Design a protein around this ligand. Sequence first.
Ligand code: CLA
Ligand code: CLA
Ligand code: CLA
Ligand code: CLA
Ligand SMILES: CC1=C(/C=C/C(C)=C/C=C/C(C)=C/C=C/C=C(C)/C=C/C=C(C)/C=C/C2=C(C)C[C@@H](O)CC2(C)C)C(C)(C)CCC1
Ligand SMILES: CC1=C(/C=C/C(C)=C/C=C/C(C)=C/C=C/C=C(C)/C=C/C=C(C)/C=C/C2=C(C)CCCC2(C)C)C(C)(C)CCC1
Ligand SMILES: CC1=C(/C=C/C(C)=C/C=C/C(C)=C/C=C/C=C(C)/C=C/C=C(C)/C=C/C2=C(C)CCCC2(C)C)C(C)(C)CCC1
Ligand SMILES: CCCCCCCCCCCCO[C@@H]1O[C@H](CO)[C@@H](O[C@H]2O[C@H](CO)[C@@H](O)[C@H](O)[C@H]2O)[C@H](O)[C@H]1O
Ligand SMILES: CCCCCCCCCCCCO[C@@H]1O[C@H](CO)[C@@H](O[C@H]2O[C@H](CO)[C@@H](O)[C@H](O)[C@H]2O)[C@H](O)[C@H]1O
Ligand SMILES: CCCCCCCCCCCCCCCC(=O)O
Ligand SMILES: [Cl-]
Ligand SMILES: [Cl-]
Ligand SMILES: [Fe+2]
Lengths: 36, 36, 33, 33, 341, 51, 34, 38, 152, 333, 47, 30, 35, 62, 51, 81
Amino acid sequence: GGRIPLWIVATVAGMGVIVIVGLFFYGAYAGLGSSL
Amino acid sequence: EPNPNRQPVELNRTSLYLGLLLILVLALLFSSYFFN
Amino acid sequence: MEVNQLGLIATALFVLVPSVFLIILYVQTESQQ
Amino acid sequence: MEVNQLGLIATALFVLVPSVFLIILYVQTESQQ
Amino acid sequence: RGWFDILDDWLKRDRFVFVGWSGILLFPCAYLALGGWLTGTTFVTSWYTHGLASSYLEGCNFLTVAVSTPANSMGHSLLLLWGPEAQGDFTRWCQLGGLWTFIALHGAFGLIGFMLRQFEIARLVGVRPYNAIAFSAPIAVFVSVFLIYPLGQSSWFFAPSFGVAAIFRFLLFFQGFHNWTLNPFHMMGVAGVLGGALLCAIHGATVENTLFQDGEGASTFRAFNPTQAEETYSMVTANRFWSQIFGIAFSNKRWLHFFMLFVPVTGLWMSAIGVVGLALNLRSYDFISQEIRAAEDPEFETFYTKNLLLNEGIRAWMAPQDQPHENFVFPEEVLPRGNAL
Amino acid sequence: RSWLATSHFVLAFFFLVGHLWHAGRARAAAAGFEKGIDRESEPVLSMPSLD
Amino acid sequence: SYPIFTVRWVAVHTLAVPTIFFLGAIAAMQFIQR
Amino acid sequence: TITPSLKGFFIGLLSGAVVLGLTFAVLIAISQIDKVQR
Amino acid sequence: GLPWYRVHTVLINDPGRLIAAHLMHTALVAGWAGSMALYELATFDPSDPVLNPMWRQGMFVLPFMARLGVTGSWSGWSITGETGIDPGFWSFEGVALAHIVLSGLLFLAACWHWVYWDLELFRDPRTGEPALDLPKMFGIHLFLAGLLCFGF
Amino acid sequence: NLWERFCNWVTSTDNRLYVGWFGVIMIPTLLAATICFVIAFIAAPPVDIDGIREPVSGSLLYGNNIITGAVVPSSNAIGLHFYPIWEAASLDEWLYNGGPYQLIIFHFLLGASCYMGRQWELSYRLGMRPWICVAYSAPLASAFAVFLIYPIGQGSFSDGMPLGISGTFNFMIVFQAEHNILMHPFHQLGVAGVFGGALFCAMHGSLVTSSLIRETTETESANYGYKFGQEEETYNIVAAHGYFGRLIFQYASFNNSRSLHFFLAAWPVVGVWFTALGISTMAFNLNGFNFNHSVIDAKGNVINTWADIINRANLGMEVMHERNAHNFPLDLA
Amino acid sequence: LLFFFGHIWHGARTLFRDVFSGIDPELSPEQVEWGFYQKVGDVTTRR
Amino acid sequence: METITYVFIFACIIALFFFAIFFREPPRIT
Amino acid sequence: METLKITVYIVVTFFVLLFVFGFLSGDPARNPKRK
Amino acid sequence: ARRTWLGDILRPLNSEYGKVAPGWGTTPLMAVFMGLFLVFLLIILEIYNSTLILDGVNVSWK
Amino acid sequence: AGIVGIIAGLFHILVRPPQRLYKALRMGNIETVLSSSIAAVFFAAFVVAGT
Amino acid sequence: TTGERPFSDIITSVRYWVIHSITIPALFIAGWLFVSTGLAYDVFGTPRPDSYYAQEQRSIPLVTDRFEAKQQVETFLEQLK
Ligand code: CLA
Ligand code: CLA
Ligand code: CLA
Ligand code: CLA
Ligand SMILES: CC1=C(/C=C/C(C)=C/C=C/C(C)=C/C=C/C=C(C)/C=C/C=C(C)/C=C/C2=C(C)C[C@@H](O)CC2(C)C)C(C)(C)CCC1
Ligand SMILES: CC1=C(/C=C/C(C)=C/C=C/C(C)=C/C=C/C=C(C)/C=C/C=C(C)/C=C/C2=C(C)CCCC2(C)C)C(C)(C)CCC1
Ligand SMILES: CC1=C(/C=C/C(C)=C/C=C/C(C)=C/C=C/C=C(C)/C=C/C=C(C)/C=C/C2=C(C)CCCC2(C)C)C(C)(C)CCC1
Ligand SMILES: CCCCCCCCCCCCO[C@@H]1O[C@H](CO)[C@@H](O[C@H]2O[C@H](CO)[C@@H](O)[C@H](O)[C@H]2O)[C@H](O)[C@H]1O
Ligand SMILES: CCCCCCCCCCCCO[C@@H]1O[C@H](CO)[C@@H](O[C@H]2O[C@H](CO)[C@@H](O)[C@H](O)[C@H]2O)[C@H](O)[C@H]1O
Ligand SMILES: CCCCCCCCCCCCCCCC(=O)O
Ligand SMILES: [Cl-]
Ligand SMILES: [Cl-]
Ligand SMILES: [Fe+2]
């Protein structure tokens, strides 16, 4: 039911989204499509 | 025998103002292209 | 300026015909009671 | 034929303005009762 | 009851996601269009159709990815996977731009399914179907721009590619080649869109700033009851405010909301008509009298003539790479340019 | 110079917006109608018509 | 009490499973060198 | 004669028929299973 | 009262006046066809079919007349460039005259159907209400259209 | 007391058009700007906008139409210098150097700021909530961006937006050439704002019109089912919420009318706020995203993207804009 | 294109003729609320 | 004649502005 | 030009003083509820 | 209403208003014909579009 | 197509519509004829524009 | 209200995370390996960074015929990509 608090779920999911988008910006600066 | 499907037609002053604005603005827009 | 000569009549009728149509409808609306 | 270009617009307005004036008056007359 | 009636009962059951009869057309087509765009922008190149990288796999970002149109030599081919061009080869089908026609057709039938969904739900809940009538304008825009415009032109190649920077290219192409800003139908479209944004902002602010005090909380959102019979804001006060500020004001709520319907829908329809005109290259490109005067008088200058010089620059400098099938080799000395720059 | 000028124009404009918000709200709260119009004592209903 | 596999389950997973697959793909793409 | 494009058209027609038929068969089966209690 | 954009909704339950309105529209379209053909004939230059054909002269309804077999004129020219051909009655001028006459006749029929709207044919013979049997109307019109298509 | 009577007249809510003190500033400036705009749009002589003695004709009498006519921005030789009438030797010099543009834009910006203040003032006098002026601050910020802030950043009122239709198009195209505004996220937020504003306008109108409560016959307009000042709501918000919640899903639908109308206010206002800030931040030459030659293959060959095609179009506009005004390779401002 | 809009308009007018002067003023909230009916808009499927 | 046409249409628009503001249908509370 | 300069300065000063002293003349009290 | 000679003759052609066939009638036959028509439209569209290429059918001015 | 139209016209003269299709398509309403005719008309208009 | 368990009840359940701490990383790893093994290049025909050009060429492999476009792409790929 609710044995894991929803604020923890939202915090972890948001941190994962932040990590993924930050990885995408790092890849904008590294590797393919970085102009270097 | 009068036709029983005849109906009165109405156009209020607000509708007159809106329609005149539409016609005049359309004319102002399309007059340059009509003159070309 | 070498404009289209039918431009004047086109613009004039484009103004007048729907305008007088709306004026006809409004004035006949006002005379109803 | 080299005619006056304002001839068309003059004739058109000469027809239109008094005619629509009379039509306005007639249609508003019919809607009275 | 019959299989048809039992199936109709199942399709119209109340769920989190309503399905309906229109769902059978909508959900496959819309899902496939969206999945094809994501698949194309993630994995599929434009190297053989345009000579462009257009996927995340090639190093493009979100702004520069696109599912590009097929090559010009394909013409207006439907480019079916089993069709004579791809012959069932999925890899070649992706390389030949078949994903573009896939997305365009599945999107068209998805939009048809969505308007049918609007009609079906409006019939079921007992409301008038004005939302579908309003949605006719996005359908008209999509059909005119993505279907009618390339059909008028030489091939699917000159349709918009499904991507951000590709759509920006489409905008600049229409400026350079069609003078689409000078088209009065596009002007009516701009008027409709900006007037709809104005009406949205002004109506929202007017309602929020004429609310009745129906609660003691400073945050007024709690004070509204969904089933209440009274108006939540003062129409009389709003009418007097706008009458004294602007001169004119709405006094009929129903006319106000119909007007909010009417403005952007009419704008989008006018722009679709203009796009059909551009599909046949029937442009509002030039004013003939100004051309005659500027040709015979080298001192007559307007912003319109400057815009024409800009369009000449756009065409000459973008044509070799935007249209690689023409094999345009423009030498440096033929390129129009001003002094210095 | 570009970074500082752009950032502080964004901040200055948003602070002008915030000043407008809080100035209007302070005026309405001091005058007593920041939560909306009282139904029984609507001021416009006590005013003569414009036309 | 509540059924597990519904229409909502199907729609949610048809959106979510390819989303996570594609996110893993693009995350792998971030480390590709030319 | 059967050109390769005619064979392709028949393949596409059969694929469309199969997809539509499988869709309606699944929908009819689910409707018969999960009925409405009137 | 009725708004302007709904005025013709008075015709919905009046089959006779609906027929009169359709007849008037048909008269207008046929009169347009005749007058457009006459204007094009007054402006057409037939002397150079090679470098000044009809599509260089902005002729709109002349190609549609030419498509189905009308090639000659009462003035003795033909759009194919041949001379000495007699078009009979069905020249471009003859087609335009036929359309003008048809427009006039449809105008008269429209006037008659407007005045004599109350016909027993347009009423249900069981309730006395105005009613059109639209499926059988479609059957009759489809039969007539099929006959005309087969004949054409 | 005469001053008290004048104060009572100025702040009176019984005037047909409300004046207020923001109005006592607003009315003269807007009248001056309007009169000067009409006179200049009809009859102004050509204006040397680029400062290179190549005057641009913008008025109707000098060969323009409605589409091509404009009030041409002041001379590049003037730059940011204040150029009133009394700083010119004659009116002919003032008209040659583009003085009407400065007069009109300064009077219009003052009048429009006081229009925002007047909106607050009338809202305060009527007992309303005061934030309609906050909504109006977005187009006002846009006008300030294109008429004042962009000239300030570029260093000349010649780079401000011309007061005309084709001049506006020229402003757009040159702006895209020099700043890549399409690739700027603030302009993308603005496009989202205006597209969403039109979308939500049509959506809200169609949903309210869809749920109108039957108070009329098929003969009469549905709008006559509403009477001005009626207490009862003219439409069924529960039915509209049910329709929209079945259209997408239930929790994507507003059931609170106040929340819905706040969203309608907030979306285009925030979007236009961001696009006005985009114009100002590109006025300080913080341009849109540059992805030219970003995608590079293994050997080092440039693999073109759609951004490179945009770059080709921008290069065409750049080399053709103000074709006589540049003497040096870089277009620094 | 304009006749596509005309077809949409007249199809809407035909299929929704009972409500085109406005929806029912006595429309029940249970009709548009969720879960009151098993099938949307069918009174006989009251749950 | 083109300049006269533009100015005439503009003047009619301004006159319509005047009549729509000051000679409107007065909104009456009901 | 000089006469026009002083004339415009007088007009602008008059309107600005009207604005300033109008908003110094008990403007918060000119609301329909509190005063 | 006015009775006329032509009206009397055309009267049986407008005397079955509201008459219907019971139940589903000939709807499945209509569905079969509609499917065949859709296939036919697809055929002619693919021929014009040159997706379907038939022997002896050169879709060009020739 | 003329022969097929003759046969279908004979069918539609002799065979009444199904009750299901009569109710669904509102065959007692002339506006359904207007809607379907406008649909066929714009189909034919698109066809003639393309050809 | 529609007869399904609310999303808050599901995503805060331990059973959901028992399933999904397995399923979600499995799909993430699947996509990662779909790219990193190079299967995406083969499935979709996307050029590798060493596959846009032959070593000494600067022309672009653009298809110029409708019905031999597959053969043109295969010929272009045969030329050492
Ligand atoms: C119901 C939803 C729906 C709809 C409307 C469409 C529509 C379309 N799809 Mg699509 N598709 C769908 C679901 C849908 N799809 C699904 C779920 C998938 C995943 C499997 C796909 C996968 C897919 C691919 C991979 C492709 C398409 C393509 C197309 C387009 C051309 C298809 C064609 O010509 O076949 C027409 C076929 C029919 C209309 C079926 C005819 C049915 C009637 C009853 C006749 C049956 C005759 C008989 C019983 C059997 C055949 C006789 C035999 C001799 C052969 C078309 C716009 C192509 C495309 O977009 O090209 C760019 C393409 O390549 N689709
Ligand atoms: C006055 C503010 C200001 C200014 C002018 C700068 C300027 C700069 N910073 Mg800096 N920074 C700031 C604040 C500021 N920073 C703050 C507050 C932090 C803490 C998070 C940092 C942390 C930081 C780091 C860690 C780094 C920089 C770097 C840089 C340099 C390059 C920045 C870049 O690439 O932009 C990127 C541009 C953006 C990310 C765009 C941001 C757009 C925002 C989100 C718009 C917000 C709008 C508005 C406020 C929202 C209101 C909403 C509305 C509804 C009300 C540049 C000199 C880099 C550098 O070179 O360092 C040497 C670097 O590595 N900064
Ligand atoms: C005795 C009758 C008659 C005849 C012989 C003609 C003859 C002609 N007319 Mg004409 N006309 C008539 C009556 C007639 N008209 C009437 C009553 C009107 C008023 C509506 C007009 C209005 C008119 C105009 C406006 C024009 C002509 C034109 C022409 C000329 C070219 C014809 C053409 O291209 O047609 C083209 C006809 C078609 C493509 C027919 C389309 C049929 C559709 C597809 C049927 C679809 C519905 C159907 C029921 C579907 C089921 C079919 C079934 C078999 C399965 C030709 C000389 C043209 C001309 O050159 O003018 C000078 C022209 O522009 N006519
Ligand atoms: C065969 C085509 C056809 C027919 C018979 C009808 C018939 C009807 N329509 Mg309709 N309509 C059509 C096509 C058609 N429409 C198309 C293509 C569209 C999309 C543009 C519409 C959009 C539409 C709307 C939005 C509405 C109707 C309404 C109506 C009804 C009242 C009309 C009225 O009083 O107008 C009176 C019209 C005028 C007094 C002036 C109109 C002048 C127009 C705007 C410009 C001038 C056009 C010009 C004279 C004709 C050019 C010919 C053109 C075809 C080339 C009537 C049953 C109304 C309705 O349902 O009422 C309940 C309604 O609200 N129609
Ligand atoms: C019923 C109804 C409607 C009306 C429907 C109508 C008018 C239906 C008409 C349908 C028609 C004419 C269908 C025709 C179908 C023809 C077909 C499928 C022909 C197929 C031919 C084939 C597969 C030939 C292939 C071959 C070729 C080309 C080469 C040969 O060497 C080998 C071979 C034989 C395999 C409306 C208008 C949609 C409204 C609602 C109600
Ligand atoms: C084509 C094709 C197909 C299809 C397929 C599909 C259907 C797929 C799907 C796919 C999918 C379905 C995918 C997905 C994806 C997704 C993604 C990739 C996402 C991402 C995201 C992100 C990154 C986020 C973002 C955001 C936003 C948007 C905003 C702000 C914030 C954030 C940042 C959070 C088939 C087989 C049928 C057939 C053949 C062909
Ligand atoms: C502007 C325009 C338009 C429109 C147009 C129209 C719509 C027109 C119409 C037209 C028409 C609609 C025309 C008509 C005409 C007609 C005529 C001209 C007729 C005549 C007739 C006659 C003459 C007859 C006679 C007679 C009689 C009556 C009787 C018997 C005998 C006779 C034969 C003697 C459009 C939109 C397109 C576009 C834009 C522009
Ligand atoms: C060059 C452009 C020319 C444009 C021409 C435009 C033509 C427009 C004509 C409009 C005619 C309206 O038709 C007119 O309607 C009014 C009501 O609406 C009718 O009037 C009827 O109803 C009213 C209202 O109950 C009664 O007072 C009246 O006794 C009765 O006859 C008139 O009998 C009819 O003549
Ligand atoms: C260290 C030295 C500082 C010196 C002062 C600095 C500058 C500030 C000047 C402020 C003067 C404004 O003075 C202001 O004048 C008006 C006009 O009589 C006064 O009087 C006003 O009172 C009421 C409400 O207040 C109004 O309805 C009335 O119309 C008006 O007469 C104000 O009550 C007073 O506040
Ligand atoms: C309603 C229409 C549905 C659309 C049909 C979906 C077709 C998807 C599958 C197509 C695969 C056939 C191509 C393979 C050809 C072969 O090599 O045999
Ligand atoms: Cl320029
Ligand atoms: Cl320089
Ligand atoms: Fe609203």
